């Protein structure tokens, strides 16, 4: 956790000998670092004088010579097509059901019905004349309940912590720290 | 459409009086065999009879006083371009693209 750390465990220059004892006797919080980085540790091999020979990293499926056809991993051309649902298609889905839950006849009798919603069908009329169970089953939810706005993050929850856990300002300060839960 | 919409655009008067725009569809390039840049209609302005480009004396740049030299508009229907040109009150002229004439091509024709 983020508990206080002894000063000699931080990479900054610190006093030694008699001055260390003076520094601990006079400072308010003896484990506060001066902030001057250790000359012998900080950036000691400069970025231009390293020893690591860099190698280009390549994950196997997308960098392999084999089993690596580009059309498998060509996601830029598998983008979701843009589909706009007008009132007419909503009516057609509402009256005829969906592809998963068909409510359309078969053969030429069905092909008659689909062609009905192949041209303009205002949705105001469709709701006026249809089974009230359809709205409770298709349009609304859970037996007539409304459709709440969907959440971008179903795992977004919060909970209240206390200073013994979040380490920040005590209870008197006018802010509260929220965890995940 | 019918309104003199240019009176609200704040554009300088010279685009109405002194410049000529062109409505055209870009032609297919001889070098490459692609046929995609020739499917959208574009509007470009004619160059100026003087002061379109002149050599900067110091560094040899290409100075210009034409503020429409790097302005090309894009459309997807020919009518939208003409309607938009009409709305602004532009003195345009349309360049009808050429249409390639169909000729059937057969592998066997090399001997027959």
């Amino acid at each position: 956790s983020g508990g206080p750390v002894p000063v000699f465990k931080k990479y900054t220059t610190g006093s030694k000998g008699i001055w260390e004892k003076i520094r601990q006797l006079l400072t308010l919080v003896p484990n506060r670092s001066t902030g001057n980085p250790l000359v012998k540790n900080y950036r000691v091999p400069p970025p231009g004088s390293q020893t690591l020979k860099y190698k280009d990293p390549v994950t196997i499926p997308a960098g392999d010579i084999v089993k690596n056809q580009y059309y498998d991993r060509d996601h830029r051309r598998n983008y979701p097509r843009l589909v706009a649902f007008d009132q007419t298609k909503v009516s057609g889905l509402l009256t005829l059901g969906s592809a998963q839950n068909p409510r359309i006849s078969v053969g030429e009798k069905g092909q008659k019905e689909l062609a009905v919603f192949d041209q303009s069908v205002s949705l105001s009329s469709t709701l006026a004349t249809i089974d009230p169970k359809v709205v409770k089953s298709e349009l609304l939810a859970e037996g007539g309940s409304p459709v709440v706005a969907p959440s971008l993050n179903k795992k977004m929850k919060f909970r209240l912590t206390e200073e013994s856990e979040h380490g920040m300002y005590p209870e008197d300060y006018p802010i509260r720290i929220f965890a995940q839960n | 459409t019918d309104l003199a919409k240019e009176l609200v655009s704040g554009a300088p008067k010279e685009l109405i009086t002194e410049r000529v725009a062109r409505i055209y569809q870009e032609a297919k390039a001889a070098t490459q065999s692609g046929q995609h840049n020739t499917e959208t209609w574009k509007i470009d302005w004619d160059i100026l009879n003087k002061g379109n480009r002149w050599e900067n004396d110091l560094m040899g740049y290409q100075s210009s006083s034409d503020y429409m030299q790097g302005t090309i508009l894009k459309f997807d229907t020919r009518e939208g371009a003409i309607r938009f040109a009409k709305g602004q009150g532009w003195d345009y002229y349309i360049q009808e693209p050429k249409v390639r004439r169909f000729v059937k091509k057969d592998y066997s024709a090399n001997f027959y």
């Binding site: 097509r81 649902f85 709440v148 | 554009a11 006083s65 030299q69 790097g70 602004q88």
Partner: protein, 240 residues
Amino acid sequence: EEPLPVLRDLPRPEYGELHAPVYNPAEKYKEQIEELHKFGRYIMGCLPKFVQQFSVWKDELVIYVAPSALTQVATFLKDHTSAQFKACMDVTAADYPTRTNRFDVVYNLLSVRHNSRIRIKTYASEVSPVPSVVPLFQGANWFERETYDLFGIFFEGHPDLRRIMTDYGFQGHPLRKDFPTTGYTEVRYDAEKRRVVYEPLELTQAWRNFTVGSSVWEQVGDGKDFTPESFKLPTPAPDP
């Protein structure tokens, strides 16, 4: 009081060949696609008089309404408990001169309630006014002030509409496609007049249009179908 480790010298993990799964990034939005589709339809059913159409892309739901349907749909999405979009984040536009109404005014609403975002699209022409949402959302005062400055859209009902970005007495609305990127004029300090004066534009190096060398081949295909299997009209099966 042990001496500090030299983090340069401490051992590092060894890896052989790395493996990372390849899968379509658009798949992980699948659950979000259905729920926006349901909630998009819900708004249309509640207000068939206004919602022309609705569209879903990944995790973004758009509602397309007329200019005369703006205040109604905005109010519904603000006050309805199922969709409490109290916060309006963005008001903007876009210029498509090919269409009869070039300007396309877009609103983004945020629901801190249910952790959702919705988008309203409403068109406009150069002279046709659009209702102002300032009476509903006070945060649109400056977003509408900016759209007029850069698109010239008439906003009906705005308490104080004026230039916010461009100079005072600036002629023309910059983000319209017909407005050249370098504008029409430029300023300099004139010795005779003892003041900074405007002069017509004259570039020492004319802008170079490298955009002509664009691709002559179509670069991205027709796309892929990701509609939920509960929002497609069923195919009438053949008879015996």
